[PDB]
Design an enzyme around this catalytic site. Structure first.
Site, PDB file in Angstrom:
ATOM      1  N   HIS A 119       0.795  -1.292   0.076  1.00  0.00           N
ATOM      2  CA  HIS A 119      -0.130  -0.011   0.085  1.00  0.00           C
ATOM      3  C   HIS A 119       0.972   1.307  -0.025  1.00  0.00           C
ATOM      4  O   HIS A 119       0.642   2.296  -0.932  1.00  0.00           O
ATOM      5  CB  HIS A 119      -1.112  -0.142   1.210  1.00  0.00           C
ATOM      6  CG  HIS A 119      -1.747   1.311   1.260  1.00  0.00           C
ATOM      7  ND1 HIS A 119      -3.132   1.220   1.177  1.00  0.00           N
ATOM      8  CD2 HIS A 119      -1.273   2.407   1.734  1.00  0.00           C
ATOM      9  CE1 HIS A 119      -3.680   2.452   1.475  1.00  0.00           C
ATOM     10  NE2 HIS A 119      -2.634   3.228   1.704  1.00  0.00           N
ATOM     11  N   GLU A 120       1.949   1.151   0.823  1.00  0.00           N
ATOM     12  CA  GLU A 120       2.621   2.569   1.044  1.00  0.00           C
ATOM     13  C   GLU A 120       3.387   2.910  -0.231  1.00  0.00           C
ATOM     14  O   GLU A 120       3.560   4.003  -0.867  1.00  0.00           O
ATOM     15  CB  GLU A 120       3.592   2.639   2.311  1.00  0.00           C
ATOM     16  CG  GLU A 120       2.823   2.396   3.487  1.00  0.00           C
ATOM     17  CD  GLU A 120       1.613   3.263   3.730  1.00  0.00           C
ATOM     18  OE1 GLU A 120       1.363   4.161   3.099  1.00  0.00           O
ATOM     19  OE2 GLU A 120       0.924   2.411   4.323  1.00  0.00           O
ATOM     20  N   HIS A 123       1.565   4.327  -2.916  1.00  0.00           N
ATOM     21  CA  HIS A 123       1.526   5.864  -2.980  1.00  0.00           C
ATOM     22  C   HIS A 123       2.501   6.546  -3.831  1.00  0.00           C
ATOM     23  O   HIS A 123       2.329   7.446  -4.126  1.00  0.00           O
ATOM     24  CB  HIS A 123       1.433   6.305  -1.625  1.00  0.00           C
ATOM     25  CG  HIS A 123       0.072   6.134  -0.750  1.00  0.00           C
ATOM     26  ND1 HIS A 123      -1.090   6.638  -1.335  1.00  0.00           N
ATOM     27  CD2 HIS A 123      -0.029   5.745   0.391  1.00  0.00           C
ATOM     28  CE1 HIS A 123      -2.080   6.353  -0.332  1.00  0.00           C
ATOM     29  NE2 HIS A 123      -1.428   5.885   0.628  1.00  0.00           N
ATOM     30  N   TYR A 155     -13.381   5.760   3.994  1.00  0.00           N
ATOM     31  CA  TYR A 155     -11.848   6.083   3.687  1.00  0.00           C
ATOM     32  C   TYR A 155     -11.518   5.783   2.500  1.00  0.00           C
ATOM     33  O   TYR A 155     -11.362   6.703   1.334  1.00  0.00           O
ATOM     34  CB  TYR A 155     -10.915   5.382   4.557  1.00  0.00           C
ATOM     35  CG  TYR A 155      -9.662   5.554   4.736  1.00  0.00           C
ATOM     36  CD1 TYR A 155      -9.396   6.728   5.441  1.00  0.00           C
ATOM     37  CD2 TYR A 155      -8.704   4.960   4.248  1.00  0.00           C
ATOM     38  CE1 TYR A 155      -7.775   7.354   5.345  1.00  0.00           C
ATOM     39  CE2 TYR A 155      -7.389   5.242   4.283  1.00  0.00           C
ATOM     40  CZ  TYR A 155      -7.137   6.503   4.702  1.00  0.00           C
ATOM     41  OH  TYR A 155      -5.644   6.779   4.731  1.00  0.00           O
ATOM     42  N   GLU A 162      -6.041   6.637  -1.777  1.00  0.00           N
ATOM     43  CA  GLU A 162      -6.221   5.672  -0.786  1.00  0.00           C
ATOM     44  C   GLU A 162      -6.519   4.374  -1.736  1.00  0.00           C
ATOM     45  O   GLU A 162      -6.380   3.215  -1.596  1.00  0.00           O
ATOM     46  CB  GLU A 162      -6.829   5.970   0.257  1.00  0.00           C
ATOM     47  CG  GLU A 162      -6.368   6.820   1.200  1.00  0.00           C
ATOM     48  CD  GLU A 162      -5.106   6.729   1.458  1.00  0.00           C
ATOM     49  OE1 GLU A 162      -4.500   5.590   1.673  1.00  0.00           O
ATOM     50  OE2 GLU A 162      -4.411   7.749   1.668  1.00  0.00           O
TER      51      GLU A 162
HETATM   52 ZN    ZN Z   1      -2.453   5.088   2.392  1.00  0.00          ZN
END
Ligand code: ZN
Length: 197
Positions: A119-120, A123, A155, A162
């Site tokens: 996930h990171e 980004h 979210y 996201e």
């Molecule tokens: Zn995130």
């Protein structure tokens, strides 16, 4: 699928030139496992991160105990109002940099992603490699349709950056999550497949 060893070899070669290990104590086997999971990401993205001199910093403690993230001490993450939690409690971040607490990969270890490091790093790929593709008109249309279908509707369903990062993690974590993304978010799946084609 008969030469996955070669793709892993190349991607781990790339990652050995991106990943930075911390001073002080941590589970070396688990840090290695995090890099192994990152090695599933398409090598074109990994080599683009490397060209931009992005380092993937693996941490032996809290994110906000690193000098470069101390400005986040006590700060409430976007979308976390009302929780009483701050960045002190959050194990990873991605964007212009990537920082990841070793041991906190799995969902629920202080974060909501299917896998922290994917996930990171997604980004960072969105921002550094793909020119903020999560804010593109093309992705906006996909997100409007499919952005709630990985859950966390207040979210992931509200912040396209996201939803992009989480979809990317599903695409690359394992065959199970990849198939789950195809079923739940077919246009997002096709979008990610074509980006890497
Ligand atoms: Zn995130």
């Amino acid at each position: 699928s008969h030469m996955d060893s070669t793709t892993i070899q190349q991607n781990k070669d790339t990652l050995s030139q991106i990943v930075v290990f911390p001073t002080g104590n941590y589970d070396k086997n688990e840090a290695n496992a995090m890099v192994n999971r990152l090695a599933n990401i398409d090598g074109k993205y990994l080599n683009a991160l490397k060209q931009n001199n992005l380092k993937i910093k693996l941490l032996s403690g809290k994110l906000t105990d690193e000098k470069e993230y101390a400005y986040l001490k006590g700060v409430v993450p976007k979308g976390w109002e009302g929780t009483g939690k701050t960045w002190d409690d959050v194990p990873g971040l991605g964007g212009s940099t990537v920082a990841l607490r070793i041991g906190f990969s799995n969902k629920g270890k202080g974060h909501d992603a299917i896998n922290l490091e994917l996930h990171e790093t997604a980004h960072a790929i969105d921002h550094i490699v793909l020119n903020d593709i999560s804010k593109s008109a093309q992705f906006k249309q996909i997100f409007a349709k499919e952005g709630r279908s990985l859950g966390n509707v207040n979210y992931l369903g509200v912040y396209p950056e996201e939803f992009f990062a989480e979809s990317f993690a599903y695409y690359y974590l394992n065959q199970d999550t990849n198939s789950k993304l195809k079923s739940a978010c077919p246009q997002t799946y096709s979008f990610l497949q074509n980006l890497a084609k």
